[PDB]
Structures are given as C-alpha cells and as structure tokens.
Design a protein around this motif. Structure first.
Motif, PDB file in Angstrom:
ATOM      1  N   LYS A 261       9.918 -27.650  12.419  1.00 23.72           N
ATOM      2  CA  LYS A 261      10.568 -28.326  13.524  1.00 23.72           C
ATOM      3  C   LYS A 261      11.303 -29.508  12.929  1.00 23.72           C
ATOM      4  O   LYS A 261      11.184 -29.782  11.736  1.00 23.72           O
ATOM      5  N   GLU A 262      12.065 -30.209  13.753  1.00 23.49           N
ATOM      6  CA  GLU A 262      12.648 -31.459  13.318  1.00 23.49           C
ATOM      7  C   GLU A 262      11.559 -32.485  13.527  1.00 23.49           C
ATOM      8  O   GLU A 262      10.776 -32.355  14.465  1.00 23.49           O
ATOM      9  N   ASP A 263      11.481 -33.497  12.671  1.00 22.21           N
ATOM     10  CA  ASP A 263      10.513 -34.544  12.943  1.00 22.21           C
ATOM     11  C   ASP A 263      11.066 -35.379  14.082  1.00 22.21           C
ATOM     12  O   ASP A 263      12.145 -35.963  13.984  1.00 22.21           O
ATOM     13  N   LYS A 264      10.315 -35.427  15.170  1.00 26.80           N
ATOM     14  CA  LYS A 264      10.787 -36.093  16.361  1.00 26.80           C
ATOM     15  C   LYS A 264      10.245 -37.503  16.388  1.00 26.80           C
ATOM     16  O   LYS A 264       9.046 -37.714  16.564  1.00 26.80           O
ATOM     17  N   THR A 265      11.135 -38.470  16.205  1.00 22.85           N
ATOM     18  CA  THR A 265      10.775 -39.866  16.383  1.00 22.85           C
ATOM     19  C   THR A 265      11.214 -40.287  17.774  1.00 22.85           C
ATOM     20  O   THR A 265      12.309 -39.944  18.215  1.00 22.85           O
ATOM     21  N   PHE A 266      10.359 -41.023  18.473  1.00 30.74           N
ATOM     22  CA  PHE A 266      10.746 -41.525  19.780  1.00 30.74           C
ATOM     23  C   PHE A 266      11.160 -42.979  19.654  1.00 30.74           C
ATOM     24  O   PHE A 266      10.330 -43.879  19.524  1.00 30.74           O
ATOM     25  N   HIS A 267      12.461 -43.205  19.732  1.00 32.17           N
ATOM     26  CA  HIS A 267      12.980 -44.539  19.543  1.00 32.17           C
ATOM     27  C   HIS A 267      13.674 -45.018  20.794  1.00 32.17           C
ATOM     28  O   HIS A 267      14.229 -44.230  21.568  1.00 32.17           O
ATOM     29  N   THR A 268      13.608 -46.325  20.997  1.00 33.28           N
ATOM     30  CA  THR A 268      14.449 -46.968  21.969  1.00 33.28           C
ATOM     31  C   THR A 268      15.541 -47.600  21.131  1.00 33.28           C
ATOM     32  O   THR A 268      15.351 -48.639  20.494  1.00 33.28           O
ATOM     33  N   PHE A 269      16.700 -46.961  21.164  1.00 30.86           N
ATOM     34  CA  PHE A 269      17.847 -47.377  20.389  1.00 30.86           C
ATOM     35  C   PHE A 269      18.718 -48.125  21.365  1.00 30.86           C
ATOM     36  O   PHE A 269      18.833 -47.721  22.520  1.00 30.86           O
ATOM     37  N   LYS A 270      19.316 -49.228  20.935  1.00 31.63           N
ATOM     38  CA  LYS A 270      20.289 -49.879  21.796  1.00 31.63           C
ATOM     39  C   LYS A 270      21.701 -49.613  21.299  1.00 31.63           C
ATOM     40  O   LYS A 270      22.134 -50.141  20.272  1.00 31.63           O
ATOM     41  N   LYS A 271      22.408 -48.782  22.054  1.00 30.89           N
ATOM     42  CA  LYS A 271      23.778 -48.409  21.752  1.00 30.89           C
ATOM     43  C   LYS A 271      24.737 -49.560  22.053  1.00 30.89           C
ATOM     44  O   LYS A 271      24.659 -50.627  21.446  1.00 30.89           O
TER      45      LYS A 271
END
Ligand SMILES: [Mg+2]
Ligand SMILES: [Mg+2]
Length: 196
Positions: free
Chosen positions: A186-196
RNA sequence: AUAGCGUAUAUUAAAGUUGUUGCAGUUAAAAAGCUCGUAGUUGAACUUCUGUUCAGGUUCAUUUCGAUUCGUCGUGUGAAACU
C-alpha cells in the motif's frame, strides 16, 4: 576468514564464501570499515527456492551475532547491495536468537525474559527478513478449516528492493517459522493537517 | 373422593410472592441529598503459536464391501476430535 565467525572451528563452503566476501569488502570499501570491524557471524544457512517460474533461486541467510546487530542495521542497505553483487544469489541477515522453553525452567532464580520466546523471536525474524524496509501493517487470517494465515502490508516506495525477495522470504519463513506469509503493497498513509 | 371422608393448626409445592440458577426499585413498595474512602467484592492485553510424520483406539459418515440375522461383527475408505 574464521575471524568472521564465533566458532571459527568449522565452516561450510557457503560460510567460506561469505567469510571471504566480508574480507573482500573490509578491504575494498572505506564506507563499511567500522561496520565490518564490528560484525561477527554465528551461522550461515543456504536455501533453495523453487517456484512455478521454473526459476531455482539460491538464497543465503546469514546470522549476525547479537552484539553486531545495531551496527548491522545501520549498514544494512549498503551491505545487502554489495553482497548481492559478490555472490550470484540474494542475501538476508538475522540476529542469532536463543529460545527459552515454556515449562522447563532450568534455574529457580531466572525468569525467562519475553525477548526470547518462540513467538517474539519468530516475529523478529520476519522483521529481519524485510530488513532494509519495515512493516506498515500486519494482519492474521483464520481460514474456515482452522489454518492460520499471515498477510503483511508494505511501503510502496520499497517495491524495487523487495519485489523478487518475497518468494524467498515466504520459503524461509515457512521453513524456520512454520508460517504462511503473504504481502501487500500500500502507500504509507500519513494523516497530516497541511495548510495550503 | 370412597372403607374411609370432613374440620382446625405447623409445614411443602403452588412462589420468578426471598430471586445462586431467578424477581422487582421513573409513576404500582422500593436508587441513600452529595462526594472522599478502609474492610469486602471486582479486576486490560503479551510467553512453545505452529507444520510434518508414525501408531493406537474412539466416534462419524457411507454410490466400500462383506459375515451372519432379526441385528451385531468384521472390513474398507476417507472425515474428524482425540491419546
Ligand atoms: Mg404516590
Ligand atoms: Mg486477566
């Protein structure tokens, strides 16, 4: 190259080969100097993997003595890469691991530490079989007949390294561990809160 | 009912109306005004998993067969859960 082993007393053709390899490397590469200084081997096993491919692939499992382990893990990629070059097979590394029996407790005052336990040790072996990479996830399946089954989820990025090795790993693990092991990428799934 | 049959009283089932099994407690009798807390009762997950191989019964099934009989034995073969 009996220096590379703990017994030093007797070595198989396979162990002569690996010993001479590590010699060649401690000589060639300044990269690995320190690392091959500290690595002593216990054992080397050879395996034959025959599959529907009709390809019979030789695979080598080499057992690093426990005190070399940290250094080994540090040098893993470089090491397996160069050793796969020096022999026409593929290589694997493990730590030499004792297993203390459940019901034969030898000394009244010694509590068998979980670090050496049938399970924990076997699992660790798997962790070593994948050694440049790591498990993203692991799940066990119960079939209807009562066979247990393993299936393991792997970082996408490491496909290059681990693709062909898979069969070898399942052969080795089926042999030593008695376990059926399957893989997934699988893809390694990181859960991030990214600020665009 | 019957050579017996009424009545009184204690006790048993009736009674899940004493409740471990097994009761109820918003309004029918029933949650303590509220917290802390000792005895008491109650306690998260992990350690020889597992495959292979041989034997022995014991169950199980039968488009396996037999042997006899008013139904057991023998034999399969495989299925098993064993030990
Ligand atoms: Mg009222
Ligand atoms: Mg418990």
């Amino acid at each position: 190259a009996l220096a590379k082993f703990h017994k030093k007393q007797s070595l198989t053709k396979i162990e002569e080969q690996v010993g001479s390899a590590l010699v060649e490397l401690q000589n060639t590469h300044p990269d690995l100097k320190t690392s091959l200084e500290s690595i002593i081997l216990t054992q080397v096993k050879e395996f034959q993997i025959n599959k529907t491919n009709k390809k019979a692939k030789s695979a080598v499992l080499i057992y690093v003595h426990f005190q070399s382990y940290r250094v080994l893990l540090s040098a893993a990629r470089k090491l397996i890469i160069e050793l796969e070059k020096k022999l026409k097979q593929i290589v694997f590394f493990t730590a030499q691991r004792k297993i203390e029996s459940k019901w034969v407790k030898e000394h009244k005052s010694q509590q068998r530490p979980r670090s050496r336990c049938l399970t924990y040790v076997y699992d660790a072996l798997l962790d070593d079989l994948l050694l440049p990479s790591t498990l993203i996830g692991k799940r066990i399946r119960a079939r209807l007949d009562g066979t247990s089954f393993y299936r393991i989820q792997l970082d996408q990025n490491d496909r290059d390294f681990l693709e062909e090795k898979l069969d070898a790993i399942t052969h080795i693990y089926k042999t030593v561990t008695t376990r059926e092991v399957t893989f997934e990428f699988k893809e390694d799934k990181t859960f991030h809160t990214f600020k665009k």
